[PDB]
């Protein structure tokens, strides 16, 4: 579990979104595993606007933050799971690191702010859904 809170927006994994998020939906994309809803209170996270490929992510299944190198956002085949059939997921970045399904939502951050959230993984890899291209999260 986990979410990003920026301005009047809440960013979560689409597969973990609540009734309130769908009722207050701003934007969602199944192919990205992302959902953005509106909030009443202002959030304090800053979204990174950069091309960093190194950062730190939180891994709940180890209660640890790991420094990682990660690939650029791309279209990657993701195996079937409880929440999606086997499909290509877009804007996904991979790293060598530990992850389990319940680690989704863990933040990946660089020196500029939040880069994305854990979304995929398996066999010593961890995948993060990028949020750096969603420029509108910084305004309105
Ligand atoms: C973080 N993560 N995730 C999954 C599977 N998965 C993919 C997710 C997706 N984005 O398509 C949907 C939820 C889910 O359970 C997984 C398996 C094994 C290890 C680490 C893992
Ligand atoms: Zn950065």
In the chain, the number of structural domains is 2
Specify burial of residue 103 (Cβ count, 10 A radius: 0-12, 13-18, 19+). buried
Choose the residue to mutate in 120, 123, 130 for probing ligand 1, maximizing ligand atoms within 8 Å of C-beta. 120
- Closest ligand relative to 115 C-alpha: 2
Cα–Cα distance, 108 to 64 (Å, whole number) = 12
Cα–Cα distance, 118 to 10 (Å, whole number) = 15
Co-location of 34 and 73 in the same domain? no
Q: Is the CB of 98 under 6 A from ligand 1?
A: no
Tell me the CA distances in angstroms from 52 to 38, 40, 126, one per residue in order: 28, 31, 17
Co-location of 49 and 96 in the same domain? yes
What is residue 14's DSSP assignment?
A: G
Co-location of 29 and 51 in the same domain? no
Co-location of 75 and 15 in the same domain? no
Print the domain residue range for 55: 45-140
Neighbours of 123 (CB within 10 A): 5
Q: Which atom of ligand 1 is nearest to the CA of 127?
A: 1
Max CA distance (Å), the chain: 40
Co-location of 34 and 97 in the same domain? no
Co-location of 63 and 40 in the same domain? no
Residue with tokens 């730190």: 56
Q: Cβ distance 84 to 15 under 8 Å? A: yes
Contacts of 136 (CB under 8 A, 6+ apart): none
Q: Are strands 64-69 and 113-122 parallel, antiparallel or unpaired?
A: unpaired
């Amino acid at each position: 579990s986990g979410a990003i809170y920026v301005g009047n927006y809440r960013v979560v994994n689409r597969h973990l979104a609540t009734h309130n998020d769908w009722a207050n939906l701003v934007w969602e994309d199944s192919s990205r595993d992302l959902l953005v809803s509106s909030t009443t209170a202002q959030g304090c996270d800053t979204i990174a606007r950069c091309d960093c490929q190194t950062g730190v992510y939180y891994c709940s299944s180890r209660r640890k933050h790991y420094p990682v190198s990660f690939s650029k956002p791309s279209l990657i085949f993701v195996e079937a799971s409880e929440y999606y059939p086997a499909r290509y997921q877009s804007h996904l970045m991979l790293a060598v690191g530990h992850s389990e399904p319940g680690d989704c939502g863990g933040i990946l951050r660089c020196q500029h702010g939040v880069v994305g959230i854990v979304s995929t993984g398996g066999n010593g890899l961890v995948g993060f859904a990028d949020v750096r291209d969603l420029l509108w999260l910084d305004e309105e």
